[PDB]
Design an enzyme around this catalytic site. Structure first.
Site, PDB file in Angstrom:
ATOM      1  N   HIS A  45       0.818  -1.255   0.032  1.00  0.00           N
ATOM      2  CA  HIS A  45      -0.046  -0.014  -0.167  1.00  0.00           C
ATOM      3  C   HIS A  45       0.644   1.380   0.080  1.00  0.00           C
ATOM      4  O   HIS A  45       0.416   2.315  -0.217  1.00  0.00           O
ATOM      5  CB  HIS A  45      -1.020   0.088   1.214  1.00  0.00           C
ATOM      6  CG  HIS A  45      -0.423   0.247   2.535  1.00  0.00           C
ATOM      7  ND1 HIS A  45      -0.095  -0.818   3.431  1.00  0.00           N
ATOM      8  CD2 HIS A  45      -0.140   1.619   2.998  1.00  0.00           C
ATOM      9  CE1 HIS A  45       0.390   0.090   4.622  1.00  0.00           C
ATOM     10  NE2 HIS A  45       0.063   1.247   4.134  1.00  0.00           N
ATOM     11  N   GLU A  59      19.931   6.568   7.282  1.00  0.00           N
ATOM     12  CA  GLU A  59      19.385   7.815   7.800  1.00  0.00           C
ATOM     13  C   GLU A  59      18.946   7.654   9.305  1.00  0.00           C
ATOM     14  O   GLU A  59      18.753   6.401   9.749  1.00  0.00           O
ATOM     15  CB  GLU A  59      17.956   7.859   7.103  1.00  0.00           C
ATOM     16  CG  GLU A  59      17.313   9.066   7.533  1.00  0.00           C
ATOM     17  CD  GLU A  59      17.934  10.412   6.808  1.00  0.00           C
ATOM     18  OE1 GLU A  59      18.737  10.770   7.187  1.00  0.00           O
ATOM     19  OE2 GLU A  59      17.267  10.826   5.691  1.00  0.00           O
ATOM     20  N   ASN A  61      18.349  10.929  11.159  1.00  0.00           N
ATOM     21  CA  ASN A  61      17.613  12.327  11.298  1.00  0.00           C
ATOM     22  C   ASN A  61      17.236  13.039   9.852  1.00  0.00           C
ATOM     23  O   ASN A  61      17.786  12.964   9.178  1.00  0.00           O
ATOM     24  CB  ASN A  61      18.250  13.347  12.090  1.00  0.00           C
ATOM     25  CG  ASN A  61      17.298  14.781  12.192  1.00  0.00           C
ATOM     26  OD1 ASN A  61      16.771  15.130  11.315  1.00  0.00           O
ATOM     27  ND2 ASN A  61      17.788  15.340  13.325  1.00  0.00           N
ATOM     28  N   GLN A  64      18.436  16.622   8.812  1.00  0.00           N
ATOM     29  CA  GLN A  64      19.685  16.995   9.005  1.00  0.00           C
ATOM     30  C   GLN A  64      20.663  16.091   8.717  1.00  0.00           C
ATOM     31  O   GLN A  64      20.308  14.846   8.606  1.00  0.00           O
ATOM     32  CB  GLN A  64      19.837  17.200  10.791  1.00  0.00           C
ATOM     33  CG  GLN A  64      19.367  18.506  11.155  1.00  0.00           C
ATOM     34  CD  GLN A  64      19.542  18.514  12.842  1.00  0.00           C
ATOM     35  OE1 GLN A  64      18.644  19.206  13.322  1.00  0.00           O
ATOM     36  NE2 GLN A  64      20.149  17.788  13.275  1.00  0.00           N
ATOM     37  N   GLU A  69      24.355   9.195   5.033  1.00  0.00           N
ATOM     38  CA  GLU A  69      23.369   8.783   4.229  1.00  0.00           C
ATOM     39  C   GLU A  69      23.999   8.295   2.671  1.00  0.00           C
ATOM     40  O   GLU A  69      24.935   8.468   2.324  1.00  0.00           O
ATOM     41  CB  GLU A  69      22.503  10.081   3.858  1.00  0.00           C
ATOM     42  CG  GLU A  69      21.924  10.472   4.990  1.00  0.00           C
ATOM     43  CD  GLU A  69      22.701  11.558   6.144  1.00  0.00           C
ATOM     44  OE1 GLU A  69      23.845  11.434   5.791  1.00  0.00           O
ATOM     45  OE2 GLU A  69      21.909  12.345   6.481  1.00  0.00           O
ATOM     46  N   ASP A  93      -0.305  -7.304   1.845  1.00  0.00           N
ATOM     47  CA  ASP A  93       0.434  -6.021   1.924  1.00  0.00           C
ATOM     48  C   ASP A  93       1.984  -6.172   1.879  1.00  0.00           C
ATOM     49  O   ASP A  93       2.542  -5.953   2.896  1.00  0.00           O
ATOM     50  CB  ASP A  93      -0.280  -5.413   3.237  1.00  0.00           C
ATOM     51  CG  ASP A  93       0.155  -3.953   2.954  1.00  0.00           C
ATOM     52  OD1 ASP A  93       0.744  -3.353   1.888  1.00  0.00           O
ATOM     53  OD2 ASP A  93      -0.149  -3.290   3.735  1.00  0.00           O
ATOM     54  N   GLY A 186       2.950   6.348   8.614  1.00  0.00           N
ATOM     55  CA  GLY A 186       4.273   6.803   8.258  1.00  0.00           C
ATOM     56  C   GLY A 186       5.151   5.719   8.868  1.00  0.00           C
ATOM     57  O   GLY A 186       6.287   5.628   8.556  1.00  0.00           O
ATOM     58  N   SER A 188       4.372   2.584   8.128  1.00  0.00           N
ATOM     59  CA  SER A 188       4.011   1.328   7.399  1.00  0.00           C
ATOM     60  C   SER A 188       5.234   1.082   6.475  1.00  0.00           C
ATOM     61  O   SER A 188       5.995   1.731   6.258  1.00  0.00           O
ATOM     62  CB  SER A 188       2.926   1.817   6.557  1.00  0.00           C
ATOM     63  OG  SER A 188       1.486   1.882   7.400  1.00  0.00           O
ATOM     64  N   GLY A 189       5.397  -0.440   6.413  1.00  0.00           N
ATOM     65  CA  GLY A 189       6.289  -0.766   5.426  1.00  0.00           C
ATOM     66  C   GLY A 189       7.614  -1.069   6.156  1.00  0.00           C
ATOM     67  O   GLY A 189       8.541  -1.839   5.747  1.00  0.00           O
TER      68      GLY A 189
HETATM   69 CA   LIG Z   1      19.855  12.826   7.814  1.00  0.00          CA
HETATM   70 XE   LIG Z   2       0.177   2.225  10.476  1.00  0.00          XE
END
Ligand SMILES: [Ca+2]
Ligand SMILES: [Xe]
Length: 240
Positions: A45, A59, A61, A64, A69, A93, A186, A188-189
């Site tokens: 989804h 990652e 933050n 920032q 990264e 899903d 946010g 999710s996954g």
């Molecule tokens: Ca960052």
């Molecule tokens: Xe969720």
């Protein structure tokens, strides 16, 4: 993650941030797990929308520079052929993303460990959910990766009337339900990490919470059960 705390910079190095382009910037939208130098596992989804997607590994933050990264584009998206956007309660899903480039492995970037096929967890097993998702129902995304202690609730209990009833299936994992700690939009996954034989493995892919709110008593966060999909995952990587 509602009722979470800040995760250490190097505690969950297989966690990734899925982001889409918006104007001249990128927005975080979902989590995922690095499972190959060039392959990511996330929720179907999360990629229903036909956006431009990128993957960030290492990652911590979101707003920032961490100095660790790596940014790689998504070149191909493979969603489970049984997934139906109008029926998440039906399951399936789950999706796999091939990256345009192979990432470089280090202390901040590592492959997630997958359980063996068919593996089921005991009631009340110790697990953690991680993510940059809303820290409150209808609240705001977090800036730094969050974690929360989320013990499993077995199928027989989670599928009872006072809980989720028939909405959850055996191809899902339930965790939480204490009214204080939970996944939220946010997240999710992303992974549910569970401790099995002294090692953290990813047993779940965050799928949904109650429409009544993220942290709701007797309504655990619901995850896609990874151990149900090992053959499919292997089949996809070996043919793409
Ligand atoms: Ca960052
Ligand atoms: Xe969720």
């Amino acid at each position: 993650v509602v009722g979470g705390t800040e995760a250490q910079r190097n505690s969950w190095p297989s966690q990734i941030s899925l982001q889409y382009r918006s104007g001249s910037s990128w927005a975080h939208t979902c989590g995922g797990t690095l499972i190959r130098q060039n392959w990511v596992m996330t929720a179907a989804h999360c990629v229903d929308r036909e956006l431009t997607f990128r993957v960030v590994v290492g990652e911590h933050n979101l707003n920032q520079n961490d100095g660790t990264e790596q940014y790689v584009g998504v070149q191909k998206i493979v969603v489970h052929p049984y997934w139906n956007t109008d029926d998440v309660a039906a399951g399936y899903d789950i999706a796999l993303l091939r990256l345009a480039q192979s990432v470089t492995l280090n202390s901040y970037v590592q492959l997630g460990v997958l359980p063996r096929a068919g593996t089921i967890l005991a009631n009340n097993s110790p697990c953690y959910i991680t993510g940059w998702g809303l820290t409150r129902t209808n609240g705001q995304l977090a800036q730094t990766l969050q974690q929360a202690y989320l013990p499993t609730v077995d199928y027989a209990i989670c599928s009872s009337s006072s809980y989720w009833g028939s909405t959850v299936k055996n191809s899902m994992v339930c965790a939480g339900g204490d009214g204080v700690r939970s996944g939220c939009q946010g997240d999710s996954g992303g992974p549910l990490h569970c401790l099995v034989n002294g090692q953290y493995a990813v047993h779940g892919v965050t799928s949904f919470v109650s429409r009544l709110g993220c942290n709701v008593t007797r309504k655990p966060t619901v995850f896609t059960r990874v151990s149900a999909y090992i053959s499919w995952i292997n089949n996809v990587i070996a043919s793409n």
